[PDB]
Design a protein around this ligand. Structure first.
Ligand SMILES: CC[C@H](C)[C@@H](CO[C@@H](Cc1ccccc1)C(=O)N[C@@H](CCS(C)(=O)=O)C(=O)O)NC[C@@H](N)CS
Ligand SMILES: CC(C)=CCC/C(C)=C/CC/C(C)=C/COP(=O)(O)OP(=O)(O)O
Ligand SMILES: OC[C@H]1O[C@@](CO)(O[C@H]2O[C@H](CO)[C@@H](O)[C@H](O)[C@H]2O)[C@@H](O)[C@@H]1O
Ligand SMILES: [Zn+2]
Lengths: 313, 410
């Protein structure tokens, strides 16, 4: 009806249709701590919300009242909950509410309550038709919004919408190959569809990642994805990978490559490799280089790895 | 050595310039944002250097104290957005004063106690303000505040029988917990439940059945832990996950090796502070969420007899983190912040100081080793890595409640 900043907005204590109900002021105790000096509009709304909640009034006026409480503070989870309680009682049109929550999330996408309210609506309607597009728009404003990606994984999983997600991943990686949220989605999609056990899928993934590394050698995400898709089997189980990384050595060296080499040696030693002394020595040299020169911020970690390698092999 | 009025800084070493981002001539929003932050940070680092003269860093205690003291009583309507987070304001402020070793006047202590009583729901748990529904986050905050206070008056405000029933009412069959009735589910709830439950002695055999396994499912390919299974590794969720598992004595459920490599990589080579997830920006609050994982991993590894563990350092750059916090996260007017150019706030004041304290103090067994960068007065009170309230407060609180029975059980 009338927005909180609308020129004809009227305080609740002045609305005739609300005169029958007494407002419930918030009791902070005689000596208030962390006491917020609320604006008159804010307090006014919350004094009435407190009253309807207390009376558990499932009315249409209470329902509209929650919209104002939400504009005043969209993080008030109690208001959102009571609102969901009203959507059910009043049997409100959920597609209407979907439009509302779509608007809300657009203004403030970094909020836990709003994304949850949307999820509840989608579950109630068992209708996911709008999700991937809406999320894609939010992600279009912040390609890394955590809640956006989380809600997205949920809808895809719950409603089996796997079909186009890998193309989506590829498009976003094209836009920003450093977007870690996208590399994460890539893992999510693949492990939940074809899996990585299919050697053809694994090779495709390893080739793709290596290409990305060669284009942007210092992009950490690609390096992390590469170790991520190979670590479960063991890095020493892919003998060609060592040689290929060593080739990149001069022309593409970086703390990431050197670190990856240590990981490989780590696993090799762990797996009864030949030349244990040689590999141990190569690995220890790298730990020293990373600790003293190439990755000094992680000196303590690299020194620790060096000591581990020595106590084990 | 060098004169006492001059202390060489890691961030100011000439080699440090080599730690600037290398975008490989391929710009994306990510490299661009990172470069802007680094650019600003460089200017800040430079302002503390006067050729060979490098004055000791100083933690503006008084300025922070006045800021905290002022906020514990009243706040502007700019704080209307935190109307459902009041017990957090109490916890952020009290823990900060606690780290700074500023005492809490008993009048204020009692007033805070009374307020949290008003936030406590009749069904158990604490709401974000008087009359609001219980929610695990403010419940966690309130219990910690009460523990920081340490008086029996504080301890007793907690209605334990209802607190246990409440936790039960949020327990899901798969091991997770709702943040509140009809609320979202993510790893924060597991930590909140495990924290309050252990501190107040209300853990039953079934309460956390399946929780450890659910949390492990949150550990992803990166090594960190995401909010829910499948989601991106994030320091906030990783802290919650590991700390929870430590409380449950189930750290071994995680691949500690990949967790360690992940968290150590989250420390920014140039800034010295920590980022929340790979390829995102540095932020002072991660000084606690990320760096706090190291004391936890240390304890976990030491527990399983790791012979290579250090006996004097956490596996992160303690100096660099302190440099970042002291040089880039202090507001001239008091309070601490995310990064240069951000407004101060109580949340960051709390976490920047918590991280500073962890970066300053190492301990394992009877092994102690401090690294207080700057003037000696910079040294803060130690903080417990699992609960993030003083270690003394933890023992005292758990001792008190251990003298009570678990609500309606055995
Ligand atoms: C939507 C919130 C954001 C995702 C926030 C993290 O919020 C966490 C931590 C927090 C806790 C208390 C207050 C503020 C923040 C979070 O738990 N947010 C909950 C808090 C609910 S409550 C009711 O206990 O205040 C939320 O719902 O925002 N991210 C912060 C990073 N940008 C680092 S500053
Ligand atoms: C006990 C408790 C309640 C702990 C909460 C821990 C915590 C800080 C969680 C963060 C959650 C989150 C979705 C951050 C992303 O926001 P962002 O995109 O603004 O931040 P980013 O860029 O640093 O990742
Ligand atoms: O960090 C990888 C590590 O996490 C575990 C769970 O503790 O599994 C995660 O990562 C796997 C990829 O390596 C995913 O397949 C799995 O779904 C995710 O939970 C461990 O198995 C693994 O070593
Ligand atoms: Zn922050």
């Amino acid at each position: 009806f009338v927005s909180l900043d609308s020129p004809s907005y009227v305080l609740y204590r002045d609305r005739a249709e609300w005169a029958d109900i007494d407002p419930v002021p918030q009791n902070d105790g005689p000596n208030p701590v962390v006491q917020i000096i609320y604006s008159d509009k804010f307090r006014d709304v919350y004094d009435y919300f407190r009253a309807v909640l207390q009376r558990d009034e499932r009315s249409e006026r209470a329902f509209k009242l929650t919209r104002d409480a939400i504009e005043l503070n969209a993080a008030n989870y109690t208001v959102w909950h009571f609102r969901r309680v009203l959507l059910k009682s009043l049997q409100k049109d959920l597609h209407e509410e979907m439009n509302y929550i779509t608007a809300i999330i657009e203004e403030q996408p970094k909020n836990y309550q709003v994304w949850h309210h949307r999820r509840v609506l989608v579950e109630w309607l068992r209708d996911p038709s709008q999700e991937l597009e809406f999320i894609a728009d939010i992600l279009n404003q912040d390609a890394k919004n955590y809640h956006a990606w989380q809600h997205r994984q949920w809808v895809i999983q719950e409603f089996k919408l796997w079909d186009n997600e890998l193309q989506y991943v590829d498009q976003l990686l094209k836009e920003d190959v450093r977007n870690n949220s996208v590399w994460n989605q890539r893992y999510f999609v693949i492990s939940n569809t074809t899996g990585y056990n299919d050697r053809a899928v694994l090779e495709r993934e390893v080739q793709y990642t290596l290409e990305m590394i060669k284009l942007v050698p210092h992009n950490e995400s690609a390096w992390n994805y590469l170790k991520g898709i190979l670590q479960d089997r063991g890095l020493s189980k892919y003998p060609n990978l060592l040689n290929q990384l060593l080739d990149l050595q001069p022309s593409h060296s970086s703390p990431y490559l050197i670190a990856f080499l240590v990981d490989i040696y780590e696993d090799m030693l762990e797996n009864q490799c030949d030349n244990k002394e040689d590999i141990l020595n190569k690995a220890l040299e790298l730990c020293e280089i990373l600790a003293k020169e190439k990755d000094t911020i992680r000196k303590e970690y690299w020194r620790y790895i060096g000591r581990s390698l020595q106590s084990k092999h | 050595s060098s004169p006492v009025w001059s202390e060489p800084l890691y961030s100011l070493r000439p080699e440090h310039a080599r730690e600037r981002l290398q975008d490989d001539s391929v710009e994306t929003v990510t490299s661009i944002e990172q470069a802007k932050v680094e650019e600003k940070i460089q200017e800040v680092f430079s302002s503390y250097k006067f050729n060979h003269l490098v004055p000791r860093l100083v933690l503006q205690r008084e300025k922070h104290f006045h800021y905290l003291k002022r906020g514990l009583r009243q706040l502007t309507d700019a704080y209307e957005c935190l109307d459902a987070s009041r017990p957090w304001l109490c916890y952020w402020i009290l823990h900060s004063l606690e780290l700074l070793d500023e005492p809490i006047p008993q009048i204020v202590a009692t007033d805070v106690c009374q307020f949290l009583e008003l936030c406590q729901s009749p069904e158990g748990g604490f709401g974000g303000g008087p009359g609001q529904y219980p929610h695990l986050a403010p419940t966690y905050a309130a219990v910690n505040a009460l523990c920081i206070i340490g008086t029996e008056e504080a301890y007793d405000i907690i209605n334990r029988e209802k607190l246990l029933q409440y936790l039960y009412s949020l327990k899901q069959p798969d091991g997770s917990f709702l943040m509140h009735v009809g609320g979202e589910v993510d790893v924060r709830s597991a930590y909140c439940a495990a924290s309050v439950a252990s501190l107040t002695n209300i853990i039953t055999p079934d309460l956390f059945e399946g929780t450890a396994e659910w949390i492990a499912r949150c550990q992803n390919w990166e090594g960190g832990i995401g909010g829910v299974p499948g989601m991106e590794a994030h320091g906030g969720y990783t802290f919650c996950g590991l700390a929870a598992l430590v409380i449950l004595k189930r750290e071994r459920s995680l691949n500690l090796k990949s967790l360690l490599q992940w968290v150590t990589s989250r420390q920014m080579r140039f800034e010295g502070g920590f980022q929340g997830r790979c390829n995102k920006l540095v932020d002072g609050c991660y000084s606690f969420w990320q760096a706090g994982l190291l004391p936890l991993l240390h304890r976990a590894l030491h527990a399983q007899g790791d012979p290579a563990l250090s006996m004097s350092h956490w596996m992160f750059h303690q100096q660099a983190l302190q440099e970042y916090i002291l040089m880039c996260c202090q507001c001239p007017a008091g309070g601490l912040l995310d990064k240069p150019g951000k407004s101060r706030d109580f949340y960051h004041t709390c976490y920047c100081l918590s991280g500073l304290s962890i970066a300053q103090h190492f301990g394992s067994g009877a092994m102690l080793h401090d690294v207080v960068l700057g003037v000696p007065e910079n040294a803060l009170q130690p903080t417990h890595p699992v609960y993030n309230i003083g270690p003394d407060k933890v023992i005292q609180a758990t001792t008190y409640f251990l003298q009570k029975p678990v609500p309606g059980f055995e």
